[PDB]
Every structure is written in structure tokens, then in C-alpha cells.
Design a protein around this ligand. Structure first.
Ligand SMILES: Nc1ncnc2c1ncn2[C@@H]1O[C@H](COP(=O)(O)OP(=O)(O)O)[C@@H](O)[C@H]1O
Ligand SMILES: [Cl-]
Ligand SMILES: [Cl-]
Ligand SMILES: [Cl-]
Ligand SMILES: [Mg+2]
Ligand SMILES: [Mg+2]
Ligand SMILES: [Mg+2]
Length: 1286
């Protein structure tokens, strides 16, 4: 029986949940305790749930609540023993878990539930221990930045305290003079300049009234160098000479020179370029049916960083970095649709315990920040949690480690990334007449779309709820999908400054003022002051203007999606900002907009050039063999799987090229490619170029190389005209650090005024983060860790044919490998991975050697791509030619025999320079034609025949008759894997990490391979489609689901009319299942998987008796068909009681890896009654997997044997040898007997974890046999459905 006690005006129920930690996590905790000399005999942990009730539950409601709070894997339950430590969110905070779980309760009719929260009760047996050591135990069990530890369950009442609203406070300028502003500036941490203090003093003396804190806070944000970009708008004097252009004007030079294809630059959040005219697939507002709409899909692009918050709390830092950038995309124009993401990290040395590398030295860090290791453990998980749960695939990225004492521009000092680069970006699509924002009508309603606010903007500890952002995106999508009737007049993301930035910017951009009502804004924290409500940086919010007459439409759209919103003001003709408070009947803000948005003078930066003298590499301890080993262990170079498979790469159904390449799924793809629509071969490409360490020797060369590498990474994609490629430039520097300012100017000039104009590359978007350094006291000594100037270039392009992309996967057919050395034999070793791993900086770095030749290289690559003359491509970058060739051999699972005698006598420099260029593989018969073709672009003396790819395990580098380097390719491949192995091992289930790593050492692995039991080109649905009779399918979705459009598209290809059926449609009677003969429950993250993946969705059905009866009725009809995929499989497994023949079905629980798995996994189709798998039994082919809770769990061995004997298993993971497996990641989730689909006795209902709808197009299979046509094997599931309905 659960606890129930008074809690102010309410009652608080305390419910016991389930064991919270798996055995390996328990063992990890005990080992941490042993290692810190805390003698802990045992530890057990249990979730506990807290429900704050505004009215009582009856017996039935109580049983409902209890059932809602049963979820999770069925771990070993124990009777509590020893000391209780309860870990909860900090008082004053509300977990994302709380927001989601409380929505579930409400959708199951539990309106009495005011709020649910969760904690973890730890039961620690350690009968020794002093209270000092108890605080040390407690420290180990919580995150000090977001959680607190309590000694009683009943202390959870403090989480639900309701504080009375705090009033506005004035700053008494009139009563104290300027000192009041000075006091306020220090108290509120506004960081105002003297001349800003002067401006505010005058403005308010002029008005004759004291400013409120809220008005000062608002002004401080809107004027900080960041929001105002003072450095990038500054006048410069350098070495005594005035400069004619600001940094911004130099970036704009690129648009002045190359306007081509650009639709929007510097006037929104995202830049927009031309895309392709394609069939855009979405559900019509009138019919609810999914239809193709032939129109241009233009391409938006944006890249942002979130550096300081990630240094403090990396998980939410990364997660909200992604969340904010996703909102910028969605709020482009009058609404747009994010499509795919990219991710970047730069951090200091990892210093992985037990795997220290020889270049690494502990220099200490500030106590207030986390280590590089914690950033790379938790940060990628945060960014991926946002991308996965929002539903955008993350398809390209970079990850660099740098921390060294070097003799740079300011002499000998510590250079690194204690404050990291945390970068998030992406592309999206946007309609032609939404690229422009409108012109705000007077009396327009001004709306906040999204989450109830809390006091968030401890103040750098963010909080993310991606499911809220998904619900808002669905609204925005409905809006732009109305074309000319889109009701969004203007929209803007809410980010830095909260509403205090966003709403003034919304009305300003529309030439208007606003008047606002504070008490209309949705709030989860009644205590907040007007300052906190107006200025907090609570996440997942947008602001928009809608005409009064469209408000009923907007309301309907929001309610169907379950996206909260509030009309909070009206647009005024008068250009005044008014905020009123109905509670305190006063006016926290009453200001003309010109007063608020008032510029002090522009900055002048008067600076001088510092320039390091290089020092030639000391080679005394370097051999080629040792160097190969060290370089492959540099995380920058090394295999990146830990950053890739944690993130979904198939959501949308438009991913053509992800990071993982070939049958061996090696993450070496140089760029990302998406299709433009679900029915096109046109597309979009993304690449990244960065080379920060070079800036320690040469600022301008580091920038030129960033541009160059973005181009070399994208070059083997079919684009055509170089002017199609558009760049984002993100500039990270320690402004004011000696030499960095002049270097910044010179780098911006090097790209903006020189290289990009000459190549024809526009930079229509960009950002800057200008305090990339960290200071702290280490001994009695001041310490400082300062970043190199760090330009990250992201390149975006329209793609002419996604099928023609090349990867690094070498063929072993008769071939030639040719190096294109754009370094022209300079072979520079300064600031290379080679230099870094021997703790040096070296002498001269690479650089763009010849602009015409770089353009020539691009053009020549485009010609070879279009003529189908390349077998493979991989560019040269970190780790040089050696790494390029090794990675190609990894991807090809083969050997190379190369000769480097033509590349100079210095073999080390030939192999390890990081000059621009790369290796092309061509058919041996095409070698002379390819060489002549390259010669036509001026490249002859840069092109060198190296040798060939050969079947086998030999990686061999010769120079004439001398062996320069020779090793097992497998050995090198395993060395290169060691960093990801060790990361996975400390972050995930070490048993899984080890299994994955060990499989890499088996050269006999034949890679993904197929066996087909049917003809995959035979359209068995074609006779039905040809009659023109198209049966409906209910494509079912719930709040937070994300993969509903591609599911519809698969069914549509098989001849169905796909209907968009939200659970809100079933609940409002707008749709009835009695009108359908087929249903599908789609994937994604309903309710964010809170209360167990699929459970909230299922239980919202089961606890609403009418909708429940409707499902049951559907499933009991004699000819109805249903499919559940991923989240829908989870949902339907929780709905067993309504589905006949489902008694032996398992549950689907947390993966054994304890990690989200985004894999392209090999399965076989097994013999079952499943009607959707007819004709496919015995087939083996890969399929998209994307889930965290896919592990089949049975109630005991009896139930496993019964399920098996009944013959209801329909798909099983196999290894690449074709055998059923439980070894990871071949089986990605630990399901017994590889089980990942089941059917009912009648075969009419089938549920599966993988996503056949994501891979029905051959072009969307990460790897596939060359001879396939447009249809993959998985198309047959949807065709089988059509045919069965007859
Ligand atoms: N932070 C990351 N998140 C996702 N993928 C990443 C990340 N860092 C690198 N990758 C991917 O891993 C592969 C190897 O990356 P890297 O060796 O840095 O690329 P390159 O040397 O071609 O620039 C690429 O496909 C790249 O997109
Ligand atoms: Cl027990
Ligand atoms: Cl095959
Ligand atoms: Cl009802
Ligand atoms: Mg690389
Ligand atoms: Mg590359
Ligand atoms: Mg790179």
C-alpha cells in the first residue's frame, strides 16, 4: 500500500517502484567505493515515485496510478537494508521525467494528479563509516548540479512547495544616484560597461522613474557582446593601420561576390538556398490523408554552439545546444522542417583510466568545470538524446582532443579545450513562400508556443524536453503545410534572454510594438518574479504572431498535437513595449523600443600581430612504426563509433549516406547525404572542415584548411557547380588573449575576402564564441588553458543524384589507387596529429597551396563522379595519407600495396602530412583516362599512382625496393578501435563493449550479406494498385511519435491511402477504427518513453474505455491487419489484453548494452504465421534499428520455450556468418534467441522492433548489394499487406 500524507493544500502519495540499476552498474558503484576506501558491503537502489494530488483517488484510479508506475526491466527486487539515501532533483526544479509522466497521468484521466516526480532510493550497507565518509558516499550517488540527497522519503514534500509570486523590485536611481545602477549591476550580474551604465542612467533620468530589475536585465542581454556581436561589428586597427572592413563585412563579401542560389542570408536564423522540385509527402488538413505535393523543397542550414554550459553540465549543455539549433531551423521564415543534424566536440586530453597515452599530461583544471572525459561521456549522450527523441538523424560530425604546452604566438603556454566546443547544426527544408516573414497586422495575437516556464536561464545547468519540441514542430508543420493559409505571420525561436529577447525581436522584425500580460504566460513556478518569468531561458519555446481571426484554427492545430500555447499579448502600431501584471496590478515594463534597443558606440579594436616561430620536429624518438601506432590512438583520428551509434541515422526515411560505410559498417564516411523527399534521388549533402591546431602556427592557414577540408570531404558527392556549396563559419576564439585578435582578423580576411570569393563559395550564415579560455589557481600559481583560434566550416549543398556518392570502401576488383596531393610536395608536418602525439607543434603547417588547383580538384572530382569513374574516395586530413589509406582498407576489409617513392625522400613527411587532397580508387582499365582527366584541370604533377587494393590482410608501404611500413590491416584496425572500445567500456555495459571490440579482430567476418527467398523486384501489389482501389491504413501516432511520415510512404507505395490518425483524433471521435481494415503503430518516442517505452501510449488506450473498446473491436474482427514497429511494437505488446493470440508475447525492455542502439543489423525471416512476411521466410538482410528498449524479456524460461514452440517468432538477429546470435552488436539489444519480431496465432498482427519502413528504398540502405533496383526486400512487407486485403 502506497504512502499518502498532507503536503500544503494537496496530499502527496509515495509509491515504490522497481530496481533502478543493473548488476554491472551496481558493480561499478561498489568498485568506485572500494577505490575511494569507503568500505561499502552492499548497495541496492529502487525508484520511488511522488504524486502531488489536488484531490483524492478512488480505488479504481489508485490502481490505475499504480499501474502507470510499473515499468522497466524486471530486475532482482530486495527487501531494503542499511542506510537510505534518496536522490531527487533539486528543490525548485522539475525534471523532464516529471513533465512527461504528468502528461501521461492526465491523458489517462487522472486530473487529480497535479505533478508526478521521481527519485532513486539507495540502500547502502556500510556499518563502519564516519559521517564525513557518508558525505563522500552521497557525493558518488548524485549530480551536484541538478540533484540533492535526502535522508527520508517524506523530504520529497520539499519538491512540491508552492511559493507566492515575488514582486517586481525597482533599482533606486532617483534616491541613490549612479551607485544604485552600480549595486544592481553587481547584484544581478549584468556585467555592464561604464558607457552602458551611462546610457541607462540618462534614459531613466530622462523618463523620471526608477528602472525595474526586469528592464535592466532585459537591456543587459540585448546589449551583451554576444547578442550584439560587438567584436564582429568592430572597427579594427592592426599594427597601426586602420582596416576598412569589420569581420562581418568581410563574411558578407562572400555573398556580394557569390549570390548564386541563395534565397536568404543574414536576415533570419537559418540561411536558405535553392533545393529541388520534388514530391513533398504530408497529411492534408482537410482529408487527413498523406499525399505527395510537387513543389520546390528549398534547403535551410544553421550551425550553433553551446560551449560554456557544456563545461558545467555536459548532458543538458549538449542536449539544449541541439534543442536551440532545432528551434532556429523550425522558426525559419514562416515555419520550416528540420531534416538532419551534425555534431562537433573539441575537448582537452581524455586521460582514460588505464589507457593513458604518451602525449597526455595532467595540467589540472578549475574545480567548477568537468573533465574532458566527462564531457565526452555525458555530452554526446545529451546531444543524441535530443536528436533521437525529437526525431532528426545525426549524420556527420567531428571530434578533436587537444591539450598541450606549446611554444605558440604568445610563447610557451597551455593550449587546449577546457572550455569545450560543443557544436550542433543541421539542414532542413522550407517552402518557397515561407522563406520571407510577413508584415505584422495591428492587433495580431502574440503567442508563446511550447513549455511552461521555470527559473532556468546553477544558472548554466540547462534542462531538455525533446518531446515538447517535437509536439511544437508538428504544429509548425501543420502551419506551413497549409501553404497560402499558413496562419503563422511571423515566428521566432526563444533562446538567450528568454521572452525578453524573443518578443521584442518578434514585434521589431514586424515593425510593431507589443503589449503583454505577464499572468497569461504559462508557468510551472508560481513563485517566479516578473524578471524570472520574462527572462528565464526555459527550453522548447517559440513566439509567433497570428491574426485574431486565425486563432480558432491555431487552437485546433495545437490541441490535436497536444502542444501547449498561450496568447500573451497583442501587436501595437505604437512602437512601445508594455508588460502588465494582473496579479500585482502594475506594469513591470513600460518603455519605448528605441530606448530599450539603444546602441552605445561601436567597438574599436586596436591590436598587433603576434606570430610564432616554428621549431622543426625533433624526430629522435619517432619511427614510422611507432608513429602509426600513436596516431591511430589519437582520439581525433581514432574510430568514432561511440559518437555515431548512440544517435539515430535513419529517422525520416531520407538518409542515403550515414557515417557507417560498407558491409563492415566502419564509421569513415566523409560527408552525409539525404534524399530531398521520400520519392526523389535529388538530395542534400553536409560536410565539416576544421583544423584548429594549425592556428597555433598560422591563423590564416588554419582557416583556409577548414574551408579546404569541407570541400575535400564533400567532393565525391554529385553536386556539379561549386557555387551550389554554401558554408557556415563558426568562429571560436579567446578574444583578447595575446595575438588572437589580429589572428582572428587575418583568418576572417583570409576566407571572406580571399579564398571563398575566388572559389565561388558563399558564407551566408555563421556564429562566433569569443571567450574560449579557462583560468584557475592550481598551486600558489595562476593557470590558464587557452584554445587555438578554432574555425569550424560546415558545407551544405544540393545533390543532383544521391545514388552516385562514393565512400572509402575499397573494391578489390582490378584497380588503381591514385593520390591527389594538393600539398604539391610541401609535406608539412607542423601542427599535425604526428606532431601532437610526440608532444610537439613543429615548424610549418599545411595550407591551401594553390587556389586554382583546389577548385580544379573539386571540378575534376565532380566530373569523375558524374561519369561513374570512381570506385572509392577518401580525403586526407588528420593523420595524413597513412590514415586515409588505413581507413579505406578498414572500410574495404582488404589490403593495400603502395609505393611512396615519388612523394619525397622524407617518408615520415610523405605519410603524415595533413596537406589537402586524398586517394581515389579507379578501375585499372580507367587509370590512363582518369590521369588525363585530372591533367586537364592542371593537376598532373600532384597526381601519383600509389598501387592497388588487394584481397587479404596486408597493409604494405614500399619505397622502391625498401619496405617502409608493413602490418596486419586487422591489427591496425583494432588499434584504431581502441579509443571507442575504452569509451564504450566505461560508459556502457563493458561486456557489450568488449564483444563489439573483439569482433573487429576476426578477419573472417564476411560483413553484412543477403540471401533472398523471393524476387525483390516483383511487385505483387501491382495488379491491385492497377484497379485504382486503394484501401485505407490508419497510421497511428501519439504525442512524441516521429517516424509517421515514412511509414505512410511505405504503405502508399504498396497501394494504400495512408491516413494520419493521432490518438487525439480517436479520443475526439474524428476517426473510428471501424472504417479501416489495416492499422500501423509507428515508431519514435511517445511521451519520451517515460514510464517505459510504449506504456503511456498503451495505457492511455486501456484507461479510456471507449478507445480501448475500439482497439479491441478492431483486433477481434476476422480480416483486420495490424503492424507495430519500434515504439508501436512496444505499445502493442502493452495492449496484449486486447489482441487475440498474443498471450505468449514478450515485453521489450532496456537494451543489455544500457545504451541507445542505432545500427544497421542483419536479420533473418523465420517461419511463423505472419501474413506480412509471406514469401520471405529464409531471407536474410540488413534492417534499420533505432532503440534503447528493444530487448525481448520473458516472464521466465517457461514462457520463452512456449513462445518458441508456438512458432510465433518472425524475425531474428543473426551474425554475419548467418547464425542466430545474442552477441553484441550483431544482436544490438541482447534479445534471447535473437528475437525481434513476433506474430499472433492467426498471423494477422505482427510486431517488430526494427524499422522496415525506413529502408524500403534501396537508396536509404546504409549498405546494400550493388545489383538491387529501387526496392529493397522490405518493400514486400507492405505489398503483402495490400495483397492480403485483396
Ligand atoms: N561528434 C561526432 N558525432 C557524430 N559523428 C561523428 C562525430 N565525429 C566524427 N563523426 C563521424 O565519424 C567519421 C570519422 O570522423 P573524422 O575522422 O573526424 O572525419 P574526417 O577525418 O573525414 O573529417 C565521419 O563519418 C564523421 O562524420
Ligand atoms: Cl531479499
Ligand atoms: Cl550480399
Ligand atoms: Cl470518453
Ligand atoms: Mg578522420
Ligand atoms: Mg574526411
Ligand atoms: Mg575532419
Amino acid at each position: 500500500g502506497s504512502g499518502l500524507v498532507p503536503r500544503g493544500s494537496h496530499m502527496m502519495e509515495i509509491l515504490r517502484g522497481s530496481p533502478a540499476l543493473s548488476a554491472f552498474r551496481i558493480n561499478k558503484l561498489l568498485a568506485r567505493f572500494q577505490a575511494a576506501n569507503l568500505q561499502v558491503h552492499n548497495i541496492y537502489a529502487e525508484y520511488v515515485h511522488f504524486a502531488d494530488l489536488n484531490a483524492p483517488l478512488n480505488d479504481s484510479e489508485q490502481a490505475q496510478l499504480t499501474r502507470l508506475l510499473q515499468y522497466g526491466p524486471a530486475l532482482s527486487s530486495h527487501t531494503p537494508a542499511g542506510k537510505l539515501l534518496l536522490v531527487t532533483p533539486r528543490p525548485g526544479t522539475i525534471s523532464p521525467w516529471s513533465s512527461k509522466a504528468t502528461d501521461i497521468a492526465h491523458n489517462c484521466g487522472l486530473q487529480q494528479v497535479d505533478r508526478l516526480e521521481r527519485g532513486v532510493a539507495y540502500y547502502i550497507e556500510a556499518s563502519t563509516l564516519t559521517a564525513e565518509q557518508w558525505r563522500q558516499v552521497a557525493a558518488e550517488l548524485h549530480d551536484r548540479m541538478m540533484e540533492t540527497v535526502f535522508s527520508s522519503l517524506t523530504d520529497a514534500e520539499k519538491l512540491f512547495i508552492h511559493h507566492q509570486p515575488a514582486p517586481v523590485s525597482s533599482v533606486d536611481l532617483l534616491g541613490e544616484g549612479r551607485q544604485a545602477l552600480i549595486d544592481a549591476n553587481l547584484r544581478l550580474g549584468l556585467a555592464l560597461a561604464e558607457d552602458e551604465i551611462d546610457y541607462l542612467q540618462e534614459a531613466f533620468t530622462k523618463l523620471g522613474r526608477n528602472p525595474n530589475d526586469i528592464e535592466l536585465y532585459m537591456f543587459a542581454q540585448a546589449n551583451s557582446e554576444h547578442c550584439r556581436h560587438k567584436i564582429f561589428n568592430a572597427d579594427w586597427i592592426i599594427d597601426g593601420k586602420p582596416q576598412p572592413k569589420s569581420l562581418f563585412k568581410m563574411i558578407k563579401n562572400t555573398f556580394e561576390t557569390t549570390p548564386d542560389y541563395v534565397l536568404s542570408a543574414y536576415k533570419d536564423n537559418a540561411a536558405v538556398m535553392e533545393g529541388s522540385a520534388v514530391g513533398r509527402y504530408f497529411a492534408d488538413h482537410n482529408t487527413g490523408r498523406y499525399d505527395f505535393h510537387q513543389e520546390p523543397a528549398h534547403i535551410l542550414m544553421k550551425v550553433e554552439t553551446h560551449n560554456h554550459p557544456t563545461a558545467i553540465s555536459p548532458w543538458p549543455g549538449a542536449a539544449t545546444g541541439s534543442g536551440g539549433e532545432i528551434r532556429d531551423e523550425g522558426a525559419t521564415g514562416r515555419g520550416a522542417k528540420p531534416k538532419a543534424g551534425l555534431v562537433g566536440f573539441s575537448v582537452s586530453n581524455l586521460r582514460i583510466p588505464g589507457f593513458e597515452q604518451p602525449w597526455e599530461e595532467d595540467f589540472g583544471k578549475p574545480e567548477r568545470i568537468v573533465t574532458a572525459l566527462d564531457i565526452m561521456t555525458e555530452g554526446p549522450l545529451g546531444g543524441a538524446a535530443f536528436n533521437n527523441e525529437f526525431g532528426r538523424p545525426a549524420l556527420t560530425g567531428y571530434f578533436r582532443t587537444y591539450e598541450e604546452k606549446v611554444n605558440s604566438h604568445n610563447g610557451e603556454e597551455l593550449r587546449g579545450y577546457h572550455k569545450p566546443i560543443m557544436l550542433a547544426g543541421g539542414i532542413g527544408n522550407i517552402r518557397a513562400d515561407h522563406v520571407q516573414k510577413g508584415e505584422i497586422v495591428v492587433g495580431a495575437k502574440l503567442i508563446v508556443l511550447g513549455g511552461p516556464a521555470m527559473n532556468i536561464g546553477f544558472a548554466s545547468v540547462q534542462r531538455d524536453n525533446p518531446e515538447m519540441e517535437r509536439r511544437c514542430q508538428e504544429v509548425i508543420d501543420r502551419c506551413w503545410q497549409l501553404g497560402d493559409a499558413n496562419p503563422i505571420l511571423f515566428i521566432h525561436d526563444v533562446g538567450a534572454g528568454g521572452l525578453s529577447n524573443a518578443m521584442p525581436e518578434l514585434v521589431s522584425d514586424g515593425g510593431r510594438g507589443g503589449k503583454f500580460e505577464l499572468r497569461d504566460i504559462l508557468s510551472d513556478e508560481p513563485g517566479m518574479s516578473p524578471l524570472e518569468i520574462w527572462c528565464n531561458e526555459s527550453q522548447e519555446r517559440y513566439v509567433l504572431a497570428v491574426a485574431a481571426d486565425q486563432l480558432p484554427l491555431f487552437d485546433e492545430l495545437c490541441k490535436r498535437e497536444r502542444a501547449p500555447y498561450a496568447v500573451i499579448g497583442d501587436a501595437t502600431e505604437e512602437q512601445h513595449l508594455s508588460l502588465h501584471d494582473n496579479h500585482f496590478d502594475n506594469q513591470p515594463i513600460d518603455l519605448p523600443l528605441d530606448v530599450l534597443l539603444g546602441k552605445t558606440p561601436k567597438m574599436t579594436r586596436d591590436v598587433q600581430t603576434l606570430k610564432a616561430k616554428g621549431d622543426a620536429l625533433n624526430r629522435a624518438d619517432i619511427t614510422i612504426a611507432d608513429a602509426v601506432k600513436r596516431v591511430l590512438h589519437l582520439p581525433t583520428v581514432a574510430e568514432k563509433t561511440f559518437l555515431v551509434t548512440i544517435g539515430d541515422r535513419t529517422v525520416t526515411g531520407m538518409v542515403a549516406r550515414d557515417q557507417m560505410v560498407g558491409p563492415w559498417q566502419v564509421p569513415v564516411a566523409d560527408c552525409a547525404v539525404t534524399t530531398a523527399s521520400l520519392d526523389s534521388y535529388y538530395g542534400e549533402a553536409m560536410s565539416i572542415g576544421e583544423r584548429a591546431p594549425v592556428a597555433l602556427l598560422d591563423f590564416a592557414a588554419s582557416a583556409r584548411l577548414a574551408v579546404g577540408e569541407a570541400l575535400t570531404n564533400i567532393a565525391a558527392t554529385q553536386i556539379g557547380d561549386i557555387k551550389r556549396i554554401k558554408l557556415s563559419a563558426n568562429w571560436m576564439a579567446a578574444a583578447g588573449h595575446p595575438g588572437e585578435d589580429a589572428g582572428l582578423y587575418d583568418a576572417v580576411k583570409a576566407v571572406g575576402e580571399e579564398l571563398c570569393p575566388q572559389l565561388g563559395l558563399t558564407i551566408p550564415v555563421g556564429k562566433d564564441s569569443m571567450s574560449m579560455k579557462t583560468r584557475w589557481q592550481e598551486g600558489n600559481e595562476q593557470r590558464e588553458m587557452t584554445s587555438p583560434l578554432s574555425l569550424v566550416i560546415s558545407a551544405f549543398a544540393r545533390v543532383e543524384d544521391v545514388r552516385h556518392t562514393l565512400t572509402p570502401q575499397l573494391s578489390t576488383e582490378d584497380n588503381a589507387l591514385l593520390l591527389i596531393d594538393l600539398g604539391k610536395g610541401h609535406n608539412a608536418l607542423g601542427a599535425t596529429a604526428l606532431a601532437q602525439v610526440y608532444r610537439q607543434l613543429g615548424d610549418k603547417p599545411a595550407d591551401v597551396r594553390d587556389v586554382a588547383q583546389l577548385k580544379g580538384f573539386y571540378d575534376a572530382m565532380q566530373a569523375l563522379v558524374a561519369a561513374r569513374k570512381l570506385l572509392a574516395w577518401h580525403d586526407r586530413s588528420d593523420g595524413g595519407l597513412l590514415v586515409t589509406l588505413a581507413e579505406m582498407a578498414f572500410a574495404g576489409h582488404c589490403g593495400v600495396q603502395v609505393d611512396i617513392a615519388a612523394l619525397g625522400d622524407d617518408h615520415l613527411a610523405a605519410l603524415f602530412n595533413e596537406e589537402l587532397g586524398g586517394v581515389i580508387q579507379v578501375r585499372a582499365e580507367d587509370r590512363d583516362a582518369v590521369e588525363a582527366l585530372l591533367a586537364q584541370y592542371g593537376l598532373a604533377d600532384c597526381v601519383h599512382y600509389l598501387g592497388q587494393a588487394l584481397a587479404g590482410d596486408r597493409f604494405v608501404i614500399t619505397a622502391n625496393d625498401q619496405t617502409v611500413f608493413s602490418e596486419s590491416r586487422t591489427t591496425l584496425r583494432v588499434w584504431w578501435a581502441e579509443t571507442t572500445w575504452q569509451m564504450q567500456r566505461l560508459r556502457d555495459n563493458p561486456q557489450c563493449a568488449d564483444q563489439e571490440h573483439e569482433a573487429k579482430a576476426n578477419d573472417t567476418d564476411p560483413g553484412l550479406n543477403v540471401k533472398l527467398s523471393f524476387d525483390i523486384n516483383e511487385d505483387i501489389a501491382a495488379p491491385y494498385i492497377a484497379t485504382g482501389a486503394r484501401p485505407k491504413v490508419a497510421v497511428l501516432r501519439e504525442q512524441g511519435v516521429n517516424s509517421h511520415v515514412e511509414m505512410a510512404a511505405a504503405f502508399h507505395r504498396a497501394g494504400f491511402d495512408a491516413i494520419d490518425v493521432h490518438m487525439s483524433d480517436l479520443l475526439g471521435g474524428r476517426i473510428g477504427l471501424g472504417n479501416f481494415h489495416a492499422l500501423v503503430a509507428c515508431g519514435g518516442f511517445s511521451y519520451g518513453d517515460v514510464l517505459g517505452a510504449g506504456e503511456g501510449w498503451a495505457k492511455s488506450i486501456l484507461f479510456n474505455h471507449r478507445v480501448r473498446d475500439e482497439f479491441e473491436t478492431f483486433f477481434h474482427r476476422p480480416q483486420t491487419l495490424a503492424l507495430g514497429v519500434c515504439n508501436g511494437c512496444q505499445m502493442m505488446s502493452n495492449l496484449r489484453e486486447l489482441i487475440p493470440g498474443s498471450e505468449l508475447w514478450p515485453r521489450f525492455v532496456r537494451n543489455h548494452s544500457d545504451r541507445f542502439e542505432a545500427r544497421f543489423s542483419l536479420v533473418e525471416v523465420t517461419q511463423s504465421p505472419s501474413l506480412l512476411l509471406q514469401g520471405m521466410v529464409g531471407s536474410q538482410m540488413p534492417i534499420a534499428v533505432s532503440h534503447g528498449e528493444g530487448r525481448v524479456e520473458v516472464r521466465d524460461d517457461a514462457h520463452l520455450a512456449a513462445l518458441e514452440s508456438k512458432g510465433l517468432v518472425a524475425l531474428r538477429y543473426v551474425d554475419n556468418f548467418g547464425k542466430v546470435t545474442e552477441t553484441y552488436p550483431a544482436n544490438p539489444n541482447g534479445s534471447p534467441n535473437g528475437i525481434t519480431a513476433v506474430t499472433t496465432e492467426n498471423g494477422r498482427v505482427t510486431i517488430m522492433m526494427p524499422h522496415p519502413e525506413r529502408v524500403f528504398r534501396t537508396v536509404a540502405n546504409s549498405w546494400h548489394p550493388e545489383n538491387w533496383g529501387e526496392d529493397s526486400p522490405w518493400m514486400r512487407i507492405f505489398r503483402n499487406a495490400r495483397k492480403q486485403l485483396g
